[PDB]
Every structure is written in C-alpha cells, then in structure tokens.
C-alpha cells in the first residue's frame, strides 16, 4: 500500500509500505581499537586507537531479486493513482 | 584544541580520497599542571582545515562544545507500548 497526505501535492511525502521485507546486510570491516584518555579528574574520553587488519570502506548490501520484485510491486500499486500509460523512473536525491 | 594532523599510513591512490585523518594534539592530564601529547584517528567528515602546515579543528567547535555518549548506555531500540490513562 502507498499512503499519502495527498498525492497531487508535491510537498507532502508519499510513503509506501510493503508486505515482504527486503533483507539488508550492512557492515563496517575496519577493525577498531578503543583507547581511553583521561582528560582530567574522571573524564574518561574515548577515542579510536589503531586500525589493524585492512582498511576498507563500510558498505551496505541488498539482494538483487528481492529488490527487483519489490520495486515491481511498488510500481504496480503506484500506477493506480496516475493512469495506466505512465512511465515511472527513479532517481537519487537532488541536494540538501 | 588545535590539531596537528596527517594521513593514516596507507597506500594512497589519487582517485580515492582518504577517509581517515590521524591527528595528534595537546590535552590536559588528571593533574591540571601537566599535559600530554596524545594521538587519535578521526573521520574526515568531522574535521575542518583552519587557515606546508596543516592544522585542523573539530567541526563543532565554532558552534557549541558538545557531549560524549556514555558507553554504558546502548542505542538499540527497545519496544515501547504506548498506553492510555484512566478516562
């Protein structure tokens, strides 16, 4: 189901909710060391220590087939408010 | 405090921009009159270049000094059951 405040206003957020979940695995592989520095009396500041292992970039993963099928389901239930001969595409965000 | 900061000891390629800045700084110790030179790793979205020499500062420090989370307290959401008062 989609839900809206109302669809034809382009300021209020169309929010869509679906049935089957999409399992998303997200990870940081950079192995971190905690280090305590005492600031003064009892102010135990915490910092990163040394990076061991191999330095990478943290990243999220989703499966392809569930994403393609759930995007098919949300474009199927999003076409009902707009007429049936409607090309629907998706972009990323634009600024901010 | 003003930071003295460098790259982390990594094989740098020109296209990938470095995500870690290894900064070292002055910090007070438990006794107020002695001070220590300590070193930390920071992420590049939390440090700015103040204006050869590359001295840096934390991004919050021209807004407001701000608060460490305690490592006692966790961050995972427990459920909340909302409930109605009498009447």
């Amino acid at each position, epitope marked *: 189901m989609i839900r809206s405040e109302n669809i034809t206003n382009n300021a209020k957020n169309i929010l869509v909710q679906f049935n089957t979940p999409v399992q998303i695995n997200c990870t940081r592989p950079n192995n971190n060391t905690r280090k305590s520095i005492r600031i003064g009396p009892g102010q135990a500041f915490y910092a990163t220590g040394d990076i061991i292992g*191999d330095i990478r*970039q943290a990243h999220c993963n989703v499966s392809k087939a569930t994403w393609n099928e759930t995007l098919g389901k949300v474009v199927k239930q999003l076409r009902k408010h707009f007429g049936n001969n409607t090309i629907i595409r998706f972009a990323n965000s634009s600024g901010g | 405090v003003t930071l003295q900061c460098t790259n982390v000891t990594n094989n740098i390629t020109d296209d990938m921009r470095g995500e870690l800045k290894n900064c070292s700084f002055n910090m007070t110790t438990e006794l107020r009159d002695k001070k220590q030179k300590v070193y930390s790793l920071f992420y590049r979205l939390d440090v700015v270049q103040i204006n050869s020499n590359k001295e840096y500062r934390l991004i919050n420090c021209n807004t407001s000094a701000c608060t460490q989370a305690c490592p006692k307290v966790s961050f995972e959401p427990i459920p909340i059951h909302y409930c109605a008062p009498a009447g």
Partner: antibody, heavy 132, light 105 residues
Framework: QVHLQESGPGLVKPSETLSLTCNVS????????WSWIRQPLGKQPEWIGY???????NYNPSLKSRVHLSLDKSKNLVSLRLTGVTAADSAIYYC??????????????????????????WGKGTSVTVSS | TFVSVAPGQTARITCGEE??????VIWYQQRPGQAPSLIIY??????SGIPDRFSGSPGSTFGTTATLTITSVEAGDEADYYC????????????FGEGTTLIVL
C-alpha cells in the same frame, strides 16, 4: 623453451649513457610483462621495474629520471637505457619475465585490490661496474 | 641472518617488516654465484620446477612476520633467500629485504 641473453659494455666511464638489451627464445614480447633487476655485489638486488606494450610502463620512483625502458617488436628484444652512471650502479644487471595476478582483499568494485608481479626466470647476469 | 642448519632438520627463516595489511610475499631462492630463481609465488602456493616442504607463511593474519618453513634440509638448499613483500597498506617496495643465507653442515 626459454633462455635469455643479456648484453653490456661492462667497463665504462662515469657520467655516461648505459644501454643493455636482452634476447628472446620461443615466445614474444607481446604476451608478457618484462622486468629489469640490478644487484650490487653481495647486497640485496634492486628492481628497476617492468614494461609492456600499450602504456603499462610504470617505473621505479627511486630513479625516475635517468631511465628508459623500451621493447623491440621487430627484433623481439627488450632494452633498458640508463644515463649518468654513478658508482652505486656497479652491479650485475638482469632481464626477466613476469606474470601477474590479483590479490583481492575486500569489495572488488571499490578498487580494494592490487596486483603482484613475480619474476619467474632470470637472465645470465651481466657484471657492469664503472671505473677508469 | 646466516642461519646454519644441519641436514635432516627443520629451518625457519624470517625476513621483512611486520605485517600491516594483507600480505603477498614472494620468496626467492638464490643459487650462490649463479643467477637467482623463484621458489614461492603466492603466500603458500608453489609453482612447478620445485616440490613441496617450502611452506610459506599464511598472510591472512595481522601483526606477523614472514616465516618460510623448510623441513629435511639438504645440501642443495645451501642458497640465499630473498623476501619480497607486497602489502596492502604499504607502498610497493622496489627494494628487497636483507640477504639471509642458509648453511648446511
């Protein structure tokens, strides 16, 4: 079958231009990266570097200026051209072939991987020192 | 650096800086007075021209030095070994490590 064959003048003057080549047997220069390694006497050797057609010609950044690597696609040989010799190049010099690979340690599509060379064969070694 | 091992025993030769990334060591065998040669071309993979008992270090752990283990050393292993590291975190070492030599009784 492979065998290699270096060349050098050997006994040369300081501040000069030194040119060495290496010979082929069976294979060509198109199919493999080639590599040049020098070695001072009783010391650890030094890799000058490697060469390939189509731009795959990264040098050592230690020397970086006085070196020239080149192929010979007609004569099917490989050649180095050194200029301005100092006494630190008093060395056995070496041509070599190499094969590459992909050491991969993370995500492949964030360029979190690198290459290794390894020099499988060597030449005969040519003692070129510099004196008067 | 000049480890002298009597034959039939087990040699363990170390070289190079401690590991800071995933490591791709190449070991070279050097016949004395002749040309050098290759012996180990991945961490623990051997190519042809040479049999087993040259076990290379697993490079997968962190904070270690490159160990090359030989068992049942013979007189043909009177050679000079060269470590050559290819790390992930470091830049490319264009210069090999130290000259270590194995002497057989």
């Amino acid at each position: 079958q492979v065998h290699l064959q270096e060349s050098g003048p050997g006994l040369v003057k300081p501040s000069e231009t030194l040119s060495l080549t290496c010979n082929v047997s069976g294979t060509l220069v198109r199919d493999n990266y080639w590599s040049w390694i020098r070695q001072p006497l009783g010391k650890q050797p030094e890799w000058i570097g490697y060469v390939h057609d189509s731009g795959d010609t990264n040098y050592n950044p230690s020397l970086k200026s006085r070196v020239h690597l080149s192929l010979d696609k007609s004569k099917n040989l490989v050649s180095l051209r050194l200029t301005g010799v100092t006494a630190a190049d008093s060395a056995i010099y070496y041509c070599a072939t190499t094969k590459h690979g992909r050491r991969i340690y993370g995500v492949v599509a964030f360029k979190e991987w690198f290459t290794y060379f390894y020099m499988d064969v060597w030449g005969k070694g040519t003692s070129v020192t510099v004196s008067s | 650096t000049f480890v002298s091992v009597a034959p039939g025993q087990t040699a363990r030769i170390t070289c190079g800086e401690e590991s800071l990334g995933s490591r791709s060591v190449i070991w070279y065998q050097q016949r004395p007075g002749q040309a050098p040669s290759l012996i180990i071309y991945n961490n623990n993979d051997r190519p042809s021209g040479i049999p087993d008992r040259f076990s290379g270090s697993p490079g997968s752990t962190f904070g270690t030095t490159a160990t090359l283990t030989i068992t049942s050393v013979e007189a043909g292993d009177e050679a000079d070994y060269y470590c050559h590291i290819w790390d992930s975190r470091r830049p490319t070492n264009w210069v090999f490590g130290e000259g270590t030599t194995l002497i057989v009784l």
